[PDB]
Design an enzyme around this catalytic site. Structure first.
Site, PDB file in Angstrom:
ATOM      1  CG  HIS A 128      39.775  42.305  43.406  1.00  0.00           C
ATOM      2  ND1 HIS A 128      39.456  41.105  42.807  1.00  0.00           N
ATOM      3  CD2 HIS A 128      39.775  42.070  44.740  1.00  0.00           C
ATOM      4  CE1 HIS A 128      39.266  40.186  43.737  1.00  0.00           C
ATOM      5  NE2 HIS A 128      39.453  40.746  44.920  1.00  0.00           N
TER       6      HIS A 128
ATOM      7  CE  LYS B 200      33.720  44.993  29.796  1.00  0.00           C
ATOM      8  NZ  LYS B 200      34.027  43.547  29.609  1.00  0.00           N
ATOM      9  NE  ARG B 201      27.650  48.428  37.533  1.00  0.00           N
ATOM     10  CZ  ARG B 201      27.421  48.633  38.828  1.00  0.00           C
ATOM     11  NH1 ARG B 201      27.183  47.613  39.642  1.00  0.00           N
ATOM     12  NH2 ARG B 201      27.407  49.868  39.310  1.00  0.00           N
TER      13      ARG B 201
ATOM     14  CE  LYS C  50      33.915  47.376  34.064  1.00  0.00           C
ATOM     15  NZ  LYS C  50      34.603  46.057  33.936  1.00  0.00           N
TER      16      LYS C  50
ATOM     17  CB  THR D 107      35.558  37.115  35.353  1.00  0.00           C
ATOM     18  OG1 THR D 107      34.573  38.066  35.757  1.00  0.00           O
ATOM     19  CG2 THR D 107      36.670  37.080  36.369  1.00  0.00           C
TER      20      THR D 107
ATOM     21  CE  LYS E  92      31.411  35.481  34.170  1.00  0.00           C
ATOM     22  NZ  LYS E  92      30.537  36.568  34.583  1.00  0.00           N
TER      23      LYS E  92
HETATM   24  O1  LIG Z   1      38.954  40.120  40.304  1.00  0.00           O
HETATM   25  C1  LIG Z   1      37.576  40.101  39.873  1.00  0.00           C
HETATM   26  C2  LIG Z   1      37.246  41.413  39.087  1.00  0.00           C
HETATM   27  O2  LIG Z   1      37.039  42.475  40.050  1.00  0.00           O
HETATM   28  C3  LIG Z   1      36.698  43.749  39.414  1.00  0.00           C
HETATM   29  C4  LIG Z   1      36.438  44.750  40.558  1.00  0.00           C
HETATM   30  C5  LIG Z   1      37.506  45.352  41.282  1.00  0.00           C
HETATM   31  C6  LIG Z   1      37.238  46.262  42.344  1.00  0.00           C
HETATM   32  O3  LIG Z   1      38.278  46.857  43.063  1.00  0.00           O
HETATM   33  C7  LIG Z   1      35.887  46.569  42.680  1.00  0.00           C
HETATM   34  C8  LIG Z   1      34.811  45.974  41.963  1.00  0.00           C
HETATM   35  C9  LIG Z   1      35.088  45.060  40.897  1.00  0.00           C
HETATM   36  O4  LIG Z   1      34.057  44.451  40.172  1.00  0.00           O
HETATM   37  C10 LIG Z   1      37.843  44.212  38.434  1.00  0.00           C
HETATM   38  O5  LIG Z   1      37.513  45.447  37.777  1.00  0.00           O
HETATM   39  C11 LIG Z   1      37.996  43.110  37.342  1.00  0.00           C
HETATM   40  O6  LIG Z   1      39.038  43.455  36.413  1.00  0.00           O
HETATM   41  C12 LIG Z   1      38.362  41.789  38.059  1.00  0.00           C
HETATM   42  O7  LIG Z   1      38.498  40.730  37.092  1.00  0.00           O
HETATM   43  C1  LIG Z   2      31.079  37.782  34.761  1.00  0.00           C
HETATM   44  C2  LIG Z   2      30.185  39.000  35.187  1.00  0.00           C
HETATM   45  C3  LIG Z   2      30.745  40.279  35.380  1.00  0.00           C
HETATM   46  C4  LIG Z   2      32.249  40.594  35.124  1.00  0.00           C
HETATM   47  O1  LIG Z   2      32.353  40.969  33.764  1.00  0.00           O
HETATM   48  P1  LIG Z   2      33.657  41.744  33.206  1.00  0.00           P
HETATM   49  O2  LIG Z   2      33.406  41.981  31.786  1.00  0.00           O
HETATM   50  O3  LIG Z   2      34.888  41.049  33.628  1.00  0.00           O
HETATM   51  O4  LIG Z   2      33.572  43.106  33.927  1.00  0.00           O
HETATM   52  C5  LIG Z   2      29.939  41.316  35.711  1.00  0.00           C
HETATM   53  N1  LIG Z   2      28.602  41.135  35.858  1.00  0.00           N
HETATM   54  C6  LIG Z   2      28.031  39.915  35.679  1.00  0.00           C
HETATM   55  C7  LIG Z   2      26.536  39.784  35.896  1.00  0.00           C
HETATM   56  C8  LIG Z   2      28.811  38.835  35.345  1.00  0.00           C
HETATM   57  O5  LIG Z   2      28.224  37.569  35.183  1.00  0.00           O
END
Ligand SMILES: OC[C@H]1O[C@@H](c2cc(O)ccc2O)[C@H](O)[C@@H](O)[C@@H]1O
Ligand SMILES: *Cc1c(COP(=O)(O)O)cnc(C)c1O
Ligand SMILES: OC[C@H]1O[C@@H](c2cc(O)ccc2O)[C@H](O)[C@@H](O)[C@@H]1O
Ligand SMILES: *Cc1c(COP(=O)(O)O)cnc(C)c1O
Lengths: 807, 807
Positions: A348, A539-540, A545, A647, A651
């Protein structure tokens, strides 16, 4: 009542009502005179839960009779969110329950807000597991989600003085009506000890034992009567001065106490390693137990598929070998064949600080037998490499599972590639990057192992559940089949010129924005203009980011207004939300910066209601379900090559917001599907980033050639946004100017220019909506049903089914 | 026969045939047994001409009776092109003549190709005058075009060894059936001499006299029976050892011998000054003569409007003063009032090397009286400036008509602004630039004088005449009214989704390309692939137009193919054409470079038919009418801020080609009308260019950061495109690297990227055509009828009329 929400039959509404009252009386032990909204929520939850039981028991009985290949999804995170509404949706009980509670004089929406989010995840990876379970159940796969039942999930974020404060997420406080404890299936897990080499095999002895108690939660498929299981393990101490010995039981139980709050960051702590082995050890015993009850393990891979969600559960590989070799007594080669054919690994991320590299001294003390098995695996693997690339000694060093140096470490990613028959990235560009850089050596050795499986999201929770109004106007035109066959949204393209549809799509968005604008004043005391463009980035919080790039733009807009106050500009409400890992200093400084900007911008008389900066507190699944449907602009601006997939971007696309982003992760495939003209793409591509690195990134250059950028940096440095503390943001400026790994300044100009084109289109309501329709209409590929169907056919070797099981 | 080409009535076809035979017999003195195609062309020309006479005589008689305000358009250039077809179109005789010649066994198209172009112009400025005369006649304005009848127009360009060779354009060789010599209206023009100051006024005496003989050419409006006049003066020596005196008559007659072949470049030669005064002196006498025959000159401005096409005829201002003051004896102030209210000036460029600054010593010897008048004008003007901006001595210096220094010069542009009640730019961005930079001081003093009049082209010659197929499919849908009301093309937007229309538009283009591809083999021996994208850049060769940027792209495409031969790329035929001024060395080197690239690219087996580079020889009006209808991509890539307007860009837009260009000149308004999404815009904007200049343009920087650019420069330097002469292009490389005033490298990356998006759209025939329809549908604003209507109402004070005069 809307159509997609099911029928509110007279017999069922009557049945729901009596069962509701039965639970309120017998289960909650309350009467209408002392029942509170929470009591009502629980009565309803128990009533809905009753409808799952019959299907749950029959689904499992079904898998026992037919004995299909079982899919085991191992993850240390399952970001489930709330379960009440999702369950009603999948069982088509939403209108009936809406009606039944209405008749009892209750507002179901109010009760839903009482449910606690199951926050057993950090972000994308955890939520991906949740979407996957939903899709696997909807596709009739005999799948099981296996993880840890954390007592405390992701912390609840509080903003004090503009700073993030963390507080324990005691989500089990009032109880969890959805889970079913299965103490009878408790299994033992071993730690520490030592290895004894006797005549007939090696033995792991003198170990410390920790019990694993499972809790089962039902996972209903979409209206197909299939209900799978998510089994979460809880740590328990075995029952064998006195007072202290009893109190020390908590040492063993601390294993399942709390979720590590890091997302995309590796922290080599022992407790985390214990959690990883704990889930792996208990799960494998359960898997083997179920298999023997279906002994030549040759058929094991035909009945079992184990999917490793990242490297967190990587110990499954040596643990499976340990069991087959040490306990079942299979020869190494036979055991290895079975292991590889059984395991598959999903990567990931490519960020170095995120890859798991465990110190040998830790595995040596905690899991002595597993370390020996890992060395053996490494030994035999490097022999294959040596034979394929004779004399290439540096390749041997680069591919070794064991990393040399200051402190020997085990590269868990290398372990996963060696022990899995399939390795996949999560978006086309990410998967290619894996083959071209990070895992190039492995790809050269075993090209057949590498695949791509672009991520997806479930259209049930992410459309029907959170945006009923949109699902309804869509259903009115093309029916309801799209909910489990999202590709059908394509049929919406023939309505792009339909005046009625255009008006409805726009109407739904407006209603969502009013609803959210209201919510913001209700449970948080903030007023915003519902007519402004909703610009959101949720997002986090992480440097890659680039919430900071977003900040620079916001400050630019502000400076431009102050420069020409009486000039017209499209009104905007800029919303940024997300949690920062507790020990991530820069992430916490960025949050402060965001609130600081808001403090200035939101109180400047001259700006008026033309610009607002709000930090969305405690962003989580339940909140995502509220903001996403209300967004107009989706910010997906990670530096090209850093966001594996993303992801949240999907959404937003499914919910009627336009996207401004870089050609990173899934953004590339999204733009490709909708057409680049219907996307706001900007910035460097992966290739441009590499060129810049070859050359050497010098932020000063941009600072010198861009007056507007210079003005912003000087405002930050002088304390314009921090009067009382003039140097408060010195770290941020210093990072931006001298050690910005993500090239924020390099994309500033193009970003600001692209944002101008966004504002231009927003001024033309009709054309903005038409572009929106082109996005929604081509978001079909991003359904997790497509993703899972690909995993099923190309990795697990099983066929998805849309057949409804009997009632 | 197509509808827009008129009716082929039986009575008229019969009449045309007999008159054709009458002219062949009585006029050409030939019989069908010895007549050649040229003889036939002339018989036809005389027949068509007969149809103009009646209308010509009645139009002029009409203006005499009604006595409307007369418009005098003074220009040293009138790039007319061919007259036969244009006349048939405006008289609706095309089908009748087509039929009549068919019946006589002749191909009218063949005969039209025999007519010589009237090339009395260099480029845009000259062709603008031609389009304007057409529109003024179509709008029923009592207008007269006044210029010089050059014996030799723009030289015919021949390419030898890849180099441009110039040869005399003896366009009058076979005679001009369209003109009518009016020796009876010959007027005297004075040169040299000296000024005598007697009691009652100053006298210009001891002058050398040159006679001005006028030739009238008819200018028919579009089917309104209006026929205006273009009067061109020819130089003749007065009739008063012997042999030598007779032979020296040619000294005086050399004045109208040849057109200076410079476009956008000032060459301070005496002969050129003589030409400028010659046209001005003869014209003003004619104007005053006509006025007195309609004496208080107070009404002069109510009956006369004089439009100065650039500064070439600027001497009209002091000449008018000379006549009113010295000859009519009006007081200075009265005369000045009349002059300002009568004159208006149109600026066409901001390039310093193009502005006319005549040495005082030349005007001193050639026109002593005019120099005195200019000093007086300057004196009184600076007094106004001094009074409005007391103490601003530098402003006085900057606004003076007299420039100090090495050699005192007269700034003709300043003279025009001071002596005109209106000054206009030719495109919005150009007009703004005039007020912000070049004429800022003048704008501050007299803001009311400055206006904008965006250029336009005549839809008769540039659509109906050169692209009958397109005019026809358009007429089939919305009628024929658009031909004289181009805004109606908007109605075509409702057909953007019409499958039939899309198919026809695409069909017409394909037919045009086949026709042109054939022409290229016929009269020039070159084969091209009609299925490739026709990428064309036709216009005069100049560094600011950046044909070199186009060259860099072509070489990039070539290098990419050679790099990955078996990779697919959209096929392209890159066509570049245009003449270079005889003394413009760099322009001639660029032409050589273009042919040199073609020599390499066109003979590389690996490239195949995927890339072709052709230099269109002897580009002129008649050729423009052939290439433009056949183009797919229009190159308008001048450095932002240098192309005042451009008109070729409009022709391409009206004819179904998409545009790739910078935000320069009219490109800005074109994109605005069609929508930026339907345009391929790239590169620096005017503001970016200024920033770069502040900073300082260093080409080396781009050379160091762009590998592909570096490779190209090294190929040029090493002799890759010039084997026998390795350093042949050293001047070009040197210019590009050290003294490139137009920042070619600065727009290279974005240009190449934009070209990739073009190729992408061309791969989707349906969507490319739909975008084409969006362009054609919004090109209405660029009709010269709109331009002229604006000049008429906002500058000349007359109302345009669409009323048909009697037959
Ligand atoms: O695949 C689901 C998502 O996983 C995330 C992720 C990867 C990690 O190695 C650890 C935590 C974490 O939230 C990636 O940052 C996203 O880009 C990806 O879409
Ligand atoms: C969908 C979702 C994420 C992933 O968001 P990205 O912008 O792809 O990092 C993270 N947190 C919550 C609560 C989500 O619903
Ligand atoms: O206005 C008609 C065109 O005149 C051109 C021109 C200007 C001059 O000063 C001299 C010659 C000449 O052809 C400008 O370059 C074009 O941009 C403009 O469209
Ligand atoms: C229209 C025209 C021009 C002007 O072209 P631009 O590209 O605006 O410079 C020049 N020459 C000819 C023969 C034309 O027909």
């Amino acid at each position: 009542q809307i159509s997609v929400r099911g029928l509110a039959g007279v017999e069922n509404v009557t049945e729901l009502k009596k069962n509701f009252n039965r639970h309120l009386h017998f289960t909650l032990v309350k009467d209408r005179n002392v029942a509170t909204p929470r009591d009502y929520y629980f009565a309803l939850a128990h009533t809905v839960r009753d409808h799952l039981v019959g299907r749950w028991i029959r689904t499992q009985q079904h898998y026992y009779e037919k004995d299909p290949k079982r899919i085991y999804y191992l993850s240390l995170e399952f970001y489930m969110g709330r379960t009440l509404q999702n369950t009603m949706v999948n069982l088509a009980l939403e209108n009936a329950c809406d009606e039944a509670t209405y008749q009892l004089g209750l507002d179901m929406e109010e009760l839903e807000e009482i449910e606690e989010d199951a926050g057993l995840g950090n972000g994308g990876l955890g939520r991906l597991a949740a979407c996957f379970l939903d899709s696997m159940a909807t596709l009739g796969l005999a799948a099981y989600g296996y993880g840890i039942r954390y007592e405390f999930g992701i912390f609840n974020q509080k903003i004090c003085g503009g700073w993030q404060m963390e507080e324990a997420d005691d989500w089990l406080r009032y109880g969890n009506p959805w889970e079913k404890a299965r103490p009878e299936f408790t299994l033992p897990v071993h730690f520490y000890g030592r290895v004894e080499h006797t005549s007939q095999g090696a033995k792991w002895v003198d170990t410390q034992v920790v019990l694993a108690m499972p809790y089962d939660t039902p996972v209903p498929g979409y209206r197909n009567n299939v209900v799978n299981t998510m089994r979460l393990w809880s740590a328990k101490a075995p029952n064998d001065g006195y007072i202290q010995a009893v109190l020390d039981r908590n040492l063993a139980e601390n294993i399942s106490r709390v979720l590590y709050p890091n997302d995309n960051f590796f922290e080599g702590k022992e407790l985390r390693l214990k959690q990883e082995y704990f889930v792996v050890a208990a799960t494998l015993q359960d898997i083997i137990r179920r298999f023997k009850s279906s002994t030549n393990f040759d058929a094991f891979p035909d009945k079992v598929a184990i999917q490793l969600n990242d490297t967190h559960p990587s110990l499954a590989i040596p643990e499976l070998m340990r069991v087959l070799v040490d306990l079942e007594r299979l020869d190494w080669d036979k055991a290895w064949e079975v292991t590889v054919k059984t395991c598959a690994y999903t990567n990931h991320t490519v960020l170095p600080e995120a890859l798991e590299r465990w110190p040998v001294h830790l595995l040596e003390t905690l899991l002595p037998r597993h370390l020996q098995i890992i060395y053996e695996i490494n030994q035999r693997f490097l022999n294959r490499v040596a034979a394929a690339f004779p004399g290439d000694v540096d390749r041997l060093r680069r591919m070794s599972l064991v990393e040399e140096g200051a402190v020997k470490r085990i590269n868990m990613a290398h372990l996963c590639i060696a022990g899995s028959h399939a390795v996949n990235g999560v978006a086309r560009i990410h998967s290619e990057i894996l083959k071209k850089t990070i895992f190039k050596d492995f790809y050269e050795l075993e090209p057949h192992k590498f695949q791509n499986k672009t991520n997806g999201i479930t259209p049930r929770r992410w459309l029907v559940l959170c945006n009923p109004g949109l699902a309804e106007i869509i259903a009115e035109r093309i029916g309801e089949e799209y909910i489990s066959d999202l590709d059908q949204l394509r049929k919406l393209l023939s309505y792009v010129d339909d005046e009625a549809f255009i008006r409805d799509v726009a109407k739904v968005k407006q209603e969502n924005k009013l609803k959210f604008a209201a919510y913001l004043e209700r449970e948080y005391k903030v007023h915003i203009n519902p007519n402004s463009l909703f610009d959101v980035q949720v997002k986090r919080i992480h440097e890659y980011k680039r919430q900071l790039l977003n900040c620079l733009h916001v400050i630019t807009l502000y400076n431009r207004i102050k420069k020409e106050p009486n000039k017209f500009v499209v009104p905007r409400t800029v919303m940024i939300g997300g949690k920062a890992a507790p020990g991530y200093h820069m992430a916490k400084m960025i949050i402060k910066l965001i609130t600081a900007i808001g403090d200035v911008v939101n109180h400047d008389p001259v700006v008026g209601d033309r610009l607002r900066v709000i930090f969305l507190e405690n962003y989580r699944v339940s909140l995502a379900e509220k903001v996403i449907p209300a967004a107009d602009l989706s910010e997906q601006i990670s530096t090209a090559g850093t966001e594996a997939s993303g992801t949240g971007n999907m959404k937003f696309m499914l919910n009627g917001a336009l996207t401004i982003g870089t050609m990173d992760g899934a953004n590339v495939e999204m733009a490709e599907e909708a057409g680049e003209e219907n996307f706001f793409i900007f910035g460097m591509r992966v290739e441009d980033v590499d060129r810049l690195d070859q050359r050497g990134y010098n932020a000063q250059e941009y600072y010198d050639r861009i007056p507007e950028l210079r003005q912003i940096i000087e405002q930050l440095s002088s304390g314009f946004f921090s009067p009382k503390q003039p140097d408060l943001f010195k770290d941020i400026v210093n990072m931006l100017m001298h050690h910005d790994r993500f090239k924020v300044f390099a994309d500033y100009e193009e970003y600001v220019k692209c944002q101008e084109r966004v504002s231009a289109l927003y001024k033309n309501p009709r054309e903005w909506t038409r572009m929106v329709i082109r996005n929604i209409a081509t978001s079909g590929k991003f359904s997790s049903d497509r993703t899972i169907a690909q995993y099923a056919r190309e990795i697990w070797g099983v066929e998805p089914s849309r057949q409804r099981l009997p009632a």
